[PDB]
């Protein structure tokens, strides 16, 4: 087939957060039917970064959901050509994240190019001080409009003192070629930091996905 | 591929201009619009931009507030809403686009296809 039971991929980013220029490597794996994957990242330019890791690790895969029989996988049958897709992050303090992301097909294996941008995070905030401490399980609304794919997330990330510090999350998903687009149904993801280094210039990360719907 | 015509220009202080640009060719839901204006030139400036989702709206630095932009996938246009004009806005606006989004807007180069000009007179 094209999307094999078990599919590798690459990621290339390119970003900035309240200035600070960054751009990130990495390559992982996965099984796509199963929703499972992992990956590792590795920070080759302006490391080590002065904020926190968990605003960017949902941004390195939607083709790993394991979805019902009955619902149509949009971003599966979008390749061998791929997709797109952007994202906007509304944190509660005011902080503002930014994504665009080109999805291909390569040679077996996918191919991932990430433009992200941060802006007006408070300097005493928990992510320009890295008080955050991991993503909880997120349910990602999921309906179709406009001839794509969005989905609206209500995020919420754990802080070091015991608190948790919210997010609202818009993403638009659209297949470069036109294919079945799915009925309004959630998505169940738990994305976990597996390993890091000291200054978290290399990251490996896990995630689990699963489709669901009356 | 893309084409795109402006519309909107005229003259109006602290008034309202809806700018248009319409687009044929590539699909309106794939192509990212942005907008530049320049006055007797004075550098050609970023005004405003939209990404192909319409999620990711850079705006510039005088338009803050004051300006906004807005795009419709059905009417494949976009509308650059200019409210609480000042004179120092008078220039020559110009609609341009990208295909792929833009982490910088305000590279004109990075935008491919361009289009005509329209006038606005405070």
């Known amino acids: 087939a094209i999307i094999k039971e078990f599919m590798r991929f690459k990621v290339h980013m390119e970003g900035s957060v309240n200035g600070h220029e960054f751009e990130i490597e990495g390559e992982g794996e996965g099984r796509p039917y199963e929703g499972t994957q992992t990956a590792k990242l590795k920070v080759t330019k302006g490391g080590p970064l002065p904020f926190a890791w968990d605003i960017l690790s949902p941004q390195f895969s939607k083709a790993y959901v394991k979805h019902p029989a009955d619902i149509p996988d949009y971003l599966k049958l979008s390749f061998p050509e791929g997709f797109k897709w952007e994202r906007v992050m509304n944190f509660e303090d005011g902080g503002v994240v930014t994504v665009t992301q080109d999805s291909s097909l390569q040679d077996g294996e996918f191919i991932y190019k990430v433009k992200l941008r941060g802006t007006n995070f408070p300097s005493d905030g928990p992510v320009m001080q890295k008080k955050t401490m991991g993503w909880e399980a997120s349910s990602e609304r999921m309906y179709p409009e406009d001839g794509a794919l969005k989905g609206e997330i209500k995020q919420r990330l754990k802080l070091k003192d015991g608190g948790h510090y919210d997010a609202e999350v818009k993403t638009t998903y659209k297949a470069k070629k036109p294919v079945q687009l799915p009925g309004a149904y959630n998505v169940n993801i738990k994305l976990d930091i597996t390993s890091h280094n000291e200054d978290y210039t290399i990251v490996e990360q896990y995630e689990r996905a699963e489709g669901r719907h009356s | 591929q893309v084409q795109l015509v402006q519309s909107g220009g005229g003259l109006v202080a602290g008034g309202s201009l809806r700018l248009s640009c319409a687009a044929s060719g590539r699909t309106f839901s794939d192509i990212a619009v942005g907008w530049f204006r320049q006055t007797p030139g004075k550098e050609r400036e970023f005004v405003a931009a939209?990404?192909?989702?319409?999620?990711?709206?850079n705006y510039g630095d005088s338009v803050e507030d004051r300006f906004t932009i807005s795009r419709d996938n059905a009417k494949s246009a976009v509308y650059l809403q200019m409210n609480s004009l000042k004179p120092e806005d008078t220039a020559v606006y110009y609609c341009?686009?990208?295909?792929?989004?833009?982490?910088?807007?305000?590279?004109?180069?990075?935008?491919?296809?361009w289009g005509q000009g329209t006038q606005v007179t405070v």
């Open positions: 341009a686009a990208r295909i792929g989004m833009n982490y910088y807007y305000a590279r004109e180069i990075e935008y491919p296809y």
């Open positions: 939209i990404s192909w989702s319409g999620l990711i709206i």
